[PDB]
Design a protein around this nucleic acid. Sequence first.
RNA 1: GUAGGUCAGCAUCAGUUUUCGGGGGCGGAAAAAGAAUAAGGGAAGGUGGCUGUUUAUAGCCCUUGUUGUAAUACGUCCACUGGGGACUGAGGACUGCGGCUUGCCAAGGAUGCUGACAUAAUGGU
RNA 2: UCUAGUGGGCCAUUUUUGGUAAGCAGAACUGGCGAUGCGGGAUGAACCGAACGUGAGGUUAAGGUGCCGGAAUGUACGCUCAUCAGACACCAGAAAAGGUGUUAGUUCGAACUAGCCCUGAAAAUGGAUGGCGCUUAAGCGUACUACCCAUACCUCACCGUCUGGGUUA
RNA 3: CCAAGACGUUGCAUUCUUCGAUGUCGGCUCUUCCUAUCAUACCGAAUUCGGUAAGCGU
RNA 4: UAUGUAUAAAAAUAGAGGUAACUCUCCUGUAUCGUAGAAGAUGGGCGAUGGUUGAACGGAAGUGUUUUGACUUGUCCAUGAAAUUCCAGAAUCCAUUGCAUACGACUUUAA
Lengths: 106, 178, 196, 130, 125, 167
Amino acid sequence: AQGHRLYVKAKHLSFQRSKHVIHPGTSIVKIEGCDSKEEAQFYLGKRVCYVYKSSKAVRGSKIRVIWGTIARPHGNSGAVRARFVHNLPAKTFGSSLRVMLYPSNI
Amino acid sequence: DIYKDETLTIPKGVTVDIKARNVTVTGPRGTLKQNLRHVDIEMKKQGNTIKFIVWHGSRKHNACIRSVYSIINNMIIGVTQGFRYKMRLVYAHFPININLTENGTVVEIRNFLGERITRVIKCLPGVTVSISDEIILEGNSLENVSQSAANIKQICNVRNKDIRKFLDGIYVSERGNI
Amino acid sequence: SEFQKVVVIDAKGHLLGRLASVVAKQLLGGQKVVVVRCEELNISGHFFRNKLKYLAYLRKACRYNPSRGAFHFRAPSRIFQKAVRGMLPHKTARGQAALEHLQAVEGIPPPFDKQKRVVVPAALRVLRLKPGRKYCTVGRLSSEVGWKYNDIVAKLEERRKVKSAAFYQAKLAKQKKIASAKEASPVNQKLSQFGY
Amino acid sequence: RGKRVVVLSQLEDTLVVTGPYKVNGVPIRRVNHRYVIATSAPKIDVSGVSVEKFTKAYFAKQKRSGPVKKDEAFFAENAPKNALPAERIADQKAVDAKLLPAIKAIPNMKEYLAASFALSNGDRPHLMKF
Amino acid sequence: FKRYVEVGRVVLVTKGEYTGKLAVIVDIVDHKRALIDSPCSEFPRQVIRYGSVVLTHIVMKLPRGARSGIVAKKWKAQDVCNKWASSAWAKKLEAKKVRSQLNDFDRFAVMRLKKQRREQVNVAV
Amino acid sequence: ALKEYQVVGRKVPTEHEPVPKLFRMRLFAPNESVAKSRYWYFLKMINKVKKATGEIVAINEISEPKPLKAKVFGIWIRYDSRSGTHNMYKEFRDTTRVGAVEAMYADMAARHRARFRSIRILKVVEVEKKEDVRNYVKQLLNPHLKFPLPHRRTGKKVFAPHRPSTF
RNA sequence: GUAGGUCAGCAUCAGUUUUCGGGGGCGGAAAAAGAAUAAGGGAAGGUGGCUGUUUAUAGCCCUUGUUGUAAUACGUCCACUGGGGACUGAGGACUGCGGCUUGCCAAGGAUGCUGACAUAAUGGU
RNA sequence: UCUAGUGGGCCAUUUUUGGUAAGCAGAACUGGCGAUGCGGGAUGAACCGAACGUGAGGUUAAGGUGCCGGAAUGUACGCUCAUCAGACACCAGAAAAGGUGUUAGUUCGAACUAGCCCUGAAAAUGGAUGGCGCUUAAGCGUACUACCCAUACCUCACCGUCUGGGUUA
RNA sequence: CCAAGACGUUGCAUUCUUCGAUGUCGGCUCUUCCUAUCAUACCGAAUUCGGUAAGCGU
RNA sequence: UAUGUAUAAAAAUAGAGGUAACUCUCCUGUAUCGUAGAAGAUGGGCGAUGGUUGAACGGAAGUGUUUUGACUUGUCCAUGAAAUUCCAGAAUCCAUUGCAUACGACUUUAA
């Protein structure tokens, strides 16, 4: 079954925020194996998505997706900032995201 | 300093192995297993010599090197010749009665200062008690022999009386080897 | 670096706060964490100081209905969960969901003694304390503040260790055979230019 | 996705590319250059294959200019059986004939093109080179 | 012990722009700093801290404060190059570097070759 | 990152002083601006010169002639404390005067909680004879120096699979 | 053919910005060093030799010459240049200031090439 | 020119008077609060930073980056072990004098001299460096990078106000 | 703290809230906390003076 | 909420771990196990005699561990894919009891 997964696993950590004020427009994402801002530069501009499952069949699909793009690195520990077409729900803190390898430049 | 070292020569003792800093010194007389986890000292065994070394230690940490050398010599002496303490009873009017049970590991003291209470003390392992009013404490561990003497002396204590007149008690007289 | 579905952590030789800080962050990251051998955790500082700290904690109680006031858990795993709870936002629905993602246990129970146990070098005592500094064990601290299962935990632990030792020898016997057959294949030295 | 293909020519924006249809079954298609990871594998000789007839007009779809579409018969239409011109099949066979000898000559590349790329546990694409 | 910070010990640099290089402790500045030198041109003589190097098992006979030319002469004479490589530690490090330099086609070749290797699993009953 | 600066200056000429004297100072400062400030600080306490009525006639950055050679530096300082009645002599072993002053500032702040403003450097001298040398510096000068590597805590690499060897 | 709904992808640009890389000029003790190679001086935390000594069967320190218009680091500058990502597209014939060679142009604010869906898909409550 | 409201103020910096002292009474200069949100100091009318049209992007201030909590369990050198340590200005409090505690200094082993720790130190519901916890720190002193983010700064869009320039086609 | 337990020295009224009202002594009753300890326990000196100590009683 | 849902010695850290007083390893997992095939088709030739899958042990929470018809990418070869033509049988009530009881509840009894 290990002939798939053209994406890199990532986790939605939190919104971009100060101590008390949150900014849900842009999110903080931890990409696995990305441990520095120098490594985050490779993942800049990649296409990240949140995949979740619903009971209602939209166009005959149980799976629906919210797309987004990695915008910039965040901090020193490899976390990145991500902008989505729909702001990610606050219930996804700790949920997983798929970071594709496109738009590719490697 | 960077390098503070003391050198000791080992006798004909059989095993002095230091696994996990635990010296399981086995000699002609017996086995003494003690830990040196309380000192952060590189002691190296080569040939028939052992070097206790401290690197980058301050004065407080360097002070324990001689203590380690003293104690390592102590159970070397214990496993080679052993330790014997001769301890005499002193009483003015009431004789002190002492009984030894199961080869002396329990000592029962009665008629101390005329009291009717029996004081029973369990000696530490590796120490045996014999009656020479002289009590002989012989064993491998100087730690255990000295502690057993301390327990007996503390137990036979005079309470609420003038020590200036009441000189009754048990005090150690001689500390030597077998 | 990489998240596993469930991570089992051997708490032996770890510091309470440093490991709790790492565990709490991992739990908030959506990761399921199991911590075994919580009785083998360490708290920096000598035993009596830590004994005084817990006894001070014990005094905290309501004057009306002490059954309402702070509940003082004497188990080493429950002391660890207390540290993680204080490091989590547990009044919040996110923090609660993190708390049920943590399972801290004394010893290594049978669902976990057959699983790999990782360690956290950011919390290991040998890496994190200056040598010669005094420290205490949570298990001993627990046993002298009210925990009454220190003996049975120990006795079950050597039985597990004996079984684990038997498992290891069986696996090492297998690895000896596979290693011997490894160099017999000429391809092992053929793929030397590839770094393997 | 995950297929390995051999680049034929660079079109105006995308790459006219096909993994040999007799190897991995990927026909001649345009692929945008941002959706490919170029590999460091040994090059395949594509100098002997004609690439002038692979143009935007060649790959162009049929114009619709109306909102009416979709049908079960519509899906029964198209398909490889229908729609697919014989000239398109001939071009695919011709490029296959001109491309297979090179991948036959260089070892392990035929089956490499047949395989499918995938990421595994612990693989970090920023550290990995292709 | 087997690794002592002393004049002439060969060290492996682990942090900085010279990570992975070999050098020799020409002189000891203090408990935290030491002057090292390497025969290679890309590694100049410099004062470095012990936190960025790991002590190797190799010790060479070198007089304290030796210049770069003399250090290179002693390095060649005692043949420390390929004396470090003879150890399994260096072979493991070089294997890690070679394995990291692999590309996708080389990785596919590795997969097939080790798959050929794995298909034996023939052991005596 | 301190730097050693040769600062030469003089007061502006007047009718009373047509030819003023040139005074030079070696002083350690992060940049030329602070170097000129300290020069005026020392010249103001001694020899009746403001910054206004004086001028900096020369600025130079001095580098270590032998930055690859281990040396012993003896530094005399004036230490100002809560009591402020102190002179000190300390010795530091390293390859440059700038590093010795930097290590002095860190050591002085660590041991006595003294700040850059409180400390003024009387003189930094290179001690060449081993006999002229602090006990710790001498026992670093031991020809047979050797010691084990001290503890050094050895990407994110959380959740290590094996217990560390640490030896 | 013409123009046209919604939403995407890419290219070529403009505005704004972030992050990496290369090349070159110049400045300082016209860096300090160092290497290599000729003088002389001194010695050790004293090597071979025999505790004491002066390069020998290790070497080091100081000065000078040389290789030298040495390199590097640092500073500064280039109307020198290569990438990656992000946000924005206000205006609505023509004028203007410029570059090129009259047409062209990245020059007084986004267009071009496509695809999917024409849907509750976007959007709202 | 006509007219409104106001004619109880309060706090801070610094100077200063009455007072045993006071979250006390009284003044001087300035800045504030009152009338003012925002970032920060856990929390607070005057403290720190910054003063506010609706938004997008970028960057900072004060302050922070172990976890709660956005951001280095960063770098360098030390000091400290506290039997109820310490942890950031205002600020929410302790002194003399000692302490075979310890680390450095000064001058002729002795005295001194400093820095940290301990002692001096002592209450009443159970509870507060904000909490958890922290000991080659996640404590203290110094140095150097990277990072986080305000309604402040920068570019841009839009709203309004004001100001200036055109407009008989 | 000091040496000649002296001398010294260092420490443990205001009118801010309430006058569209907070019921204003003591006793009785009852529970809890504090230690600056009267008794009890256990130690240290020369019954007396001390240290740990608020468990228990007063 | 998965996308390979892969990995079980214990210990010390101023030491360990083996193989055979010996000697080798350590200096983390960027490692091993795995990974090829219409989301993985239909055949064939060599080679191997393996590989993956549909009674006993384990009580600490034993959710298991072990044991004893397919599927072949070990190695060669031949068809097929497309136009998805550029991202997407009990209890209770009713009754009864008084060891109980404000009322509930509790203790009994009742075919």
